[PDB]
Short mmCIF file of all heavy atoms in Angstrom, two decimals:
data_model
loop_
_atom_site.label_atom_id
_atom_site.label_comp_id
_atom_site.label_asym_id
_atom_site.label_seq_id
_atom_site.Cartn_x
_atom_site.Cartn_y
_atom_site.Cartn_z
N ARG A 25 -10.01 -10.47 -15.18
CA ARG A 25 -11.03 -11.02 -14.31
C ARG A 25 -11.16 -10.10 -13.08
O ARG A 25 -12.28 -9.80 -12.60
CB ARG A 25 -10.73 -12.43 -13.88
CG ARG A 25 -10.78 -13.36 -15.03
CD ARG A 25 -11.12 -14.78 -14.63
NE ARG A 25 -9.95 -15.38 -14.04
CZ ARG A 25 -8.99 -16.02 -14.74
NH1 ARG A 25 -9.09 -16.20 -16.04
NH2 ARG A 25 -7.96 -16.52 -14.07
N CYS A 26 -10.03 -9.66 -12.55
CA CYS A 26 -10.08 -8.78 -11.42
C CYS A 26 -10.71 -7.49 -11.78
O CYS A 26 -11.36 -6.90 -10.89
CB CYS A 26 -8.63 -8.52 -10.93
SG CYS A 26 -7.81 -9.96 -10.16
N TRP A 27 -10.56 -6.99 -13.00
CA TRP A 27 -11.19 -5.74 -13.36
C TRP A 27 -12.70 -5.92 -13.40
O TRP A 27 -13.42 -5.00 -12.92
CB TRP A 27 -10.73 -5.19 -14.74
CG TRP A 27 -11.39 -3.92 -15.13
CD1 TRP A 27 -10.97 -2.66 -14.84
CD2 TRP A 27 -12.63 -3.77 -15.77
NE1 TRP A 27 -11.84 -1.72 -15.27
CE2 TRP A 27 -12.86 -2.38 -15.87
CE3 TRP A 27 -13.56 -4.63 -16.31
CZ2 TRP A 27 -14.01 -1.83 -16.48
CZ3 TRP A 27 -14.73 -4.11 -16.91
CH2 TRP A 27 -14.95 -2.70 -16.99
N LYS A 28 -13.18 -7.02 -13.92
CA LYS A 28 -14.66 -7.21 -13.98
C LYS A 28 -15.21 -7.29 -12.58
O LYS A 28 -16.27 -6.75 -12.32
CB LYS A 28 -15.08 -8.50 -14.65
CG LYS A 28 -15.08 -8.57 -16.15
CD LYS A 28 -15.55 -9.98 -16.46
CE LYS A 28 -15.49 -10.20 -17.95
NZ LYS A 28 -15.63 -11.66 -18.22
N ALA A 29 -14.50 -7.93 -11.65
CA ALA A 29 -15.02 -8.10 -10.32
C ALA A 29 -14.74 -6.92 -9.43
O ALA A 29 -15.02 -7.01 -8.22
CB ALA A 29 -14.47 -9.33 -9.67
N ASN A 30 -14.16 -5.88 -9.97
CA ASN A 30 -13.82 -4.64 -9.20
C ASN A 30 -12.73 -4.86 -8.19
O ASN A 30 -12.27 -3.88 -7.58
CB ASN A 30 -15.05 -4.05 -8.62
CG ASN A 30 -14.93 -2.59 -8.40
OD1 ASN A 30 -14.24 -1.89 -9.13
ND2 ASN A 30 -15.48 -2.08 -7.31
N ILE A 31 -12.28 -6.06 -7.97
CA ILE A 31 -11.10 -6.39 -7.20
C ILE A 31 -9.86 -5.65 -7.75
O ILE A 31 -9.71 -5.51 -8.97
CB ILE A 31 -10.83 -7.91 -7.27
CG1 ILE A 31 -11.93 -8.62 -6.51
CG2 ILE A 31 -9.47 -8.24 -6.74
CD1 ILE A 31 -11.95 -10.15 -6.69
N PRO A 32 -9.00 -5.10 -6.89
CA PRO A 32 -7.91 -4.25 -7.36
C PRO A 32 -6.82 -4.87 -8.18
O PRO A 32 -6.22 -4.18 -9.01
CB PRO A 32 -7.34 -3.71 -6.03
CG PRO A 32 -7.64 -4.77 -5.06
CD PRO A 32 -9.05 -5.09 -5.42
N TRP A 33 -6.57 -6.17 -8.03
CA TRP A 33 -5.33 -6.77 -8.63
C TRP A 33 -4.03 -6.08 -8.34
O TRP A 33 -3.39 -5.50 -9.18
CB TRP A 33 -5.45 -6.89 -10.16
CG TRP A 33 -4.38 -7.78 -10.77
CD1 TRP A 33 -4.27 -9.13 -10.72
CD2 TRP A 33 -3.30 -7.34 -11.63
NE1 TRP A 33 -3.22 -9.56 -11.42
CE2 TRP A 33 -2.59 -8.51 -12.04
CE3 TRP A 33 -2.88 -6.14 -12.09
CZ2 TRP A 33 -1.47 -8.46 -12.83
CZ3 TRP A 33 -1.76 -6.07 -12.92
CH2 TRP A 33 -1.07 -7.27 -13.27
N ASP A 34 -3.66 -6.12 -7.06
CA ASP A 34 -2.23 -5.95 -6.71
C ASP A 34 -1.54 -7.30 -6.90
O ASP A 34 -2.21 -8.37 -6.77
CB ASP A 34 -2.06 -5.45 -5.26
CG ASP A 34 -2.66 -4.05 -5.04
OD1 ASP A 34 -2.89 -3.33 -5.99
OD2 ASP A 34 -2.85 -3.71 -3.84
N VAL A 35 -0.27 -7.30 -7.09
CA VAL A 35 0.51 -8.55 -7.08
C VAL A 35 1.76 -8.36 -6.25
O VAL A 35 2.31 -7.22 -6.20
CB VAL A 35 0.85 -8.96 -8.51
CG1 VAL A 35 1.66 -10.24 -8.56
CG2 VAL A 35 -0.39 -9.14 -9.34
N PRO A 36 2.24 -9.39 -5.52
CA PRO A 36 3.61 -9.29 -4.95
C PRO A 36 4.64 -9.08 -6.03
O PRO A 36 4.28 -8.93 -7.18
CB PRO A 36 3.76 -10.67 -4.26
CG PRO A 36 2.80 -11.55 -4.90
CD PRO A 36 1.60 -10.65 -5.16
N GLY A 37 5.91 -9.11 -5.66
CA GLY A 37 6.97 -8.56 -6.52
C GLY A 37 6.86 -8.85 -8.03
O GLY A 37 7.06 -9.97 -8.44
N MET A 38 6.51 -7.80 -8.76
CA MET A 38 6.35 -7.89 -10.20
C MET A 38 6.98 -6.58 -10.74
O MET A 38 6.79 -5.51 -10.16
CB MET A 38 4.88 -7.90 -10.61
CG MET A 38 4.70 -8.03 -12.13
SD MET A 38 2.98 -8.32 -12.60
CE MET A 38 2.78 -10.03 -12.07
N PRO A 39 7.77 -6.69 -11.81
CA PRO A 39 8.41 -5.48 -12.33
C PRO A 39 7.39 -4.43 -12.70
O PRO A 39 6.43 -4.77 -13.38
CB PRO A 39 9.17 -5.96 -13.55
CG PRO A 39 8.57 -7.27 -13.89
CD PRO A 39 8.11 -7.89 -12.58
N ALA A 40 7.56 -3.20 -12.22
CA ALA A 40 6.58 -2.15 -12.53
C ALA A 40 6.24 -1.95 -14.00
O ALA A 40 5.08 -1.81 -14.27
CB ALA A 40 7.05 -0.83 -11.89
N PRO A 41 7.24 -1.93 -14.91
CA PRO A 41 6.87 -1.69 -16.27
C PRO A 41 5.85 -2.72 -16.86
O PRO A 41 4.95 -2.32 -17.63
CB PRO A 41 8.23 -1.84 -17.04
CG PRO A 41 9.05 -2.66 -16.12
CD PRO A 41 8.69 -2.12 -14.80
N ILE A 42 6.02 -3.97 -16.51
CA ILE A 42 5.07 -4.99 -16.94
C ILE A 42 3.67 -4.68 -16.39
O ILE A 42 2.67 -4.77 -17.16
CB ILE A 42 5.54 -6.35 -16.48
CG1 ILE A 42 6.65 -6.77 -17.41
CG2 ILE A 42 4.41 -7.39 -16.42
CD1 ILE A 42 7.27 -8.12 -17.02
N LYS A 43 3.58 -4.25 -15.14
CA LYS A 43 2.33 -3.84 -14.60
C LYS A 43 1.77 -2.64 -15.37
O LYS A 43 0.54 -2.65 -15.58
CB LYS A 43 2.50 -3.49 -13.13
CG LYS A 43 1.19 -3.15 -12.41
CD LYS A 43 1.47 -2.70 -10.99
CE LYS A 43 0.22 -2.87 -10.14
NZ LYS A 43 0.51 -2.64 -8.68
N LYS A 44 2.60 -1.72 -15.81
CA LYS A 44 2.13 -0.61 -16.59
C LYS A 44 1.44 -1.08 -17.84
O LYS A 44 0.34 -0.68 -18.25
CB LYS A 44 3.31 0.33 -16.99
CG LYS A 44 4.16 0.88 -15.89
CD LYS A 44 3.33 1.53 -14.79
CE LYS A 44 2.80 2.91 -15.20
NZ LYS A 44 1.66 3.26 -14.29
N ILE A 45 2.15 -2.03 -18.50
CA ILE A 45 1.64 -2.60 -19.76
C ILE A 45 0.27 -3.24 -19.57
O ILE A 45 -0.74 -2.88 -20.21
CB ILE A 45 2.61 -3.58 -20.40
CG1 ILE A 45 3.77 -2.75 -20.90
CG2 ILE A 45 1.94 -4.32 -21.58
CD1 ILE A 45 4.92 -3.54 -21.40
N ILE A 46 0.22 -4.15 -18.60
CA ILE A 46 -1.02 -4.85 -18.36
C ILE A 46 -2.18 -3.89 -18.04
O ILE A 46 -3.29 -4.07 -18.57
CB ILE A 46 -0.79 -5.91 -17.35
CG1 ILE A 46 -0.01 -7.03 -17.94
CG2 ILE A 46 -2.11 -6.46 -16.75
CD1 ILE A 46 0.43 -7.96 -16.85
N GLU A 47 -1.92 -2.91 -17.21
CA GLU A 47 -2.94 -1.96 -16.89
C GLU A 47 -3.41 -1.19 -18.11
O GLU A 47 -4.63 -0.94 -18.29
CB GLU A 47 -2.50 -1.01 -15.80
CG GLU A 47 -2.33 -1.69 -14.47
CD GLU A 47 -3.62 -2.34 -13.99
OE1 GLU A 47 -4.69 -1.75 -14.19
OE2 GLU A 47 -3.48 -3.47 -13.41
N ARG A 48 -2.48 -0.83 -18.96
CA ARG A 48 -2.86 -0.12 -20.20
C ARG A 48 -3.78 -0.93 -21.06
O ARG A 48 -4.90 -0.42 -21.40
CB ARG A 48 -1.57 0.19 -20.98
CG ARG A 48 -1.78 1.13 -22.05
CD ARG A 48 -0.40 1.48 -22.59
NE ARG A 48 0.10 0.48 -23.51
CZ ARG A 48 1.36 0.40 -23.89
NH1 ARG A 48 2.26 1.28 -23.39
NH2 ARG A 48 1.75 -0.50 -24.75
N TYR A 49 -3.43 -2.16 -21.40
CA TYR A 49 -4.27 -2.97 -22.26
C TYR A 49 -5.60 -3.28 -21.58
O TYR A 49 -6.63 -3.33 -22.25
CB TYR A 49 -3.58 -4.20 -22.70
CG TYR A 49 -2.57 -3.90 -23.76
CD1 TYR A 49 -1.28 -3.63 -23.44
CD2 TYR A 49 -2.96 -3.85 -25.09
CE1 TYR A 49 -0.39 -3.30 -24.43
CE2 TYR A 49 -2.07 -3.54 -26.06
CZ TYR A 49 -0.78 -3.29 -25.76
OH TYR A 49 0.11 -2.96 -26.76
N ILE A 50 -5.62 -3.49 -20.27
CA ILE A 50 -6.89 -3.72 -19.62
C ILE A 50 -7.77 -2.49 -19.60
O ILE A 50 -8.99 -2.62 -19.56
CB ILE A 50 -6.69 -4.30 -18.23
CG1 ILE A 50 -6.19 -5.72 -18.41
CG2 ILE A 50 -8.01 -4.37 -17.47
CD1 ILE A 50 -5.80 -6.26 -17.10
N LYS A 51 -7.22 -1.26 -19.63
CA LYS A 51 -8.06 -0.11 -19.78
C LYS A 51 -8.59 -0.01 -21.18
O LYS A 51 -9.73 0.39 -21.38
CB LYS A 51 -7.33 1.14 -19.39
CG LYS A 51 -7.13 1.19 -17.92
CD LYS A 51 -8.47 1.32 -17.19
CE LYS A 51 -8.39 1.18 -15.66
NZ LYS A 51 -7.69 -0.10 -15.14
N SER A 52 -7.81 -0.37 -22.18
CA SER A 52 -8.38 -0.46 -23.54
C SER A 52 -9.56 -1.42 -23.63
O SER A 52 -10.63 -1.01 -24.03
CB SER A 52 -7.32 -0.86 -24.59
OG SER A 52 -6.87 -2.18 -24.39
N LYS A 53 -9.29 -2.65 -23.18
CA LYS A 53 -10.31 -3.65 -23.24
C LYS A 53 -11.54 -3.26 -22.41
O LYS A 53 -12.69 -3.54 -22.79
CB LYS A 53 -9.78 -5.00 -22.85
CG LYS A 53 -10.76 -6.11 -23.07
CD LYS A 53 -10.25 -7.48 -22.67
CE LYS A 53 -11.40 -8.45 -22.87
NZ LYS A 53 -11.11 -9.87 -22.58
N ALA A 54 -11.34 -2.62 -21.27
CA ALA A 54 -12.44 -2.20 -20.47
C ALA A 54 -13.28 -1.15 -21.21
O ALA A 54 -14.48 -1.14 -21.12
CB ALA A 54 -11.92 -1.63 -19.22
N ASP A 55 -12.58 -0.25 -21.92
CA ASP A 55 -13.34 0.79 -22.62
C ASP A 55 -14.14 0.18 -23.75
O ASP A 55 -15.30 0.57 -23.90
CB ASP A 55 -12.33 1.79 -23.27
CG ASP A 55 -11.57 2.58 -22.25
OD1 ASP A 55 -12.11 2.65 -21.08
OD2 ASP A 55 -10.45 3.08 -22.53
N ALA A 56 -13.60 -0.74 -24.50
CA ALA A 56 -14.37 -1.40 -25.54
C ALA A 56 -15.53 -2.16 -24.98
O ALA A 56 -16.65 -2.11 -25.53
CB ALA A 56 -13.49 -2.31 -26.31
N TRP A 57 -15.32 -2.83 -23.89
CA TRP A 57 -16.33 -3.64 -23.23
C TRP A 57 -17.50 -2.74 -22.76
O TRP A 57 -18.69 -3.05 -23.02
CB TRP A 57 -15.72 -4.40 -22.07
CG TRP A 57 -16.53 -5.42 -21.36
CD1 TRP A 57 -16.67 -6.70 -21.69
CD2 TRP A 57 -17.22 -5.25 -20.10
NE1 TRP A 57 -17.39 -7.39 -20.74
CE2 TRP A 57 -17.72 -6.51 -19.75
CE3 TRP A 57 -17.39 -4.17 -19.22
CZ2 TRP A 57 -18.48 -6.67 -18.64
CZ3 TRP A 57 -18.12 -4.34 -18.12
CH2 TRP A 57 -18.66 -5.57 -17.83
#
């Protein structure tokens, strides 16, 4: 949702690798979209 609204989606303390994963899949989905 943050990607569609162009909002950055930072989060307070979240393990970096999980953030890597989520960003990866959201770039896939964004490309298909």
Side-chain angles (χ1 to χ4, degrees):
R25 294 206 284 271
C26 289
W27 180 91
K28 281 179 184 167
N30 205 34
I31 291 171
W33 193 73
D34 295 343
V35 179
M38 183 170 289
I42 284 177
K43 184 186 201 168
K44 305 308 286 160
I45 290 173
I46 286 171
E47 292 301 321
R48 191 171 82 194
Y49 284 92
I50 288 172
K51 290 292 172 307
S52 66
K53 187 179 177 178
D55 294 338
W57 187 87

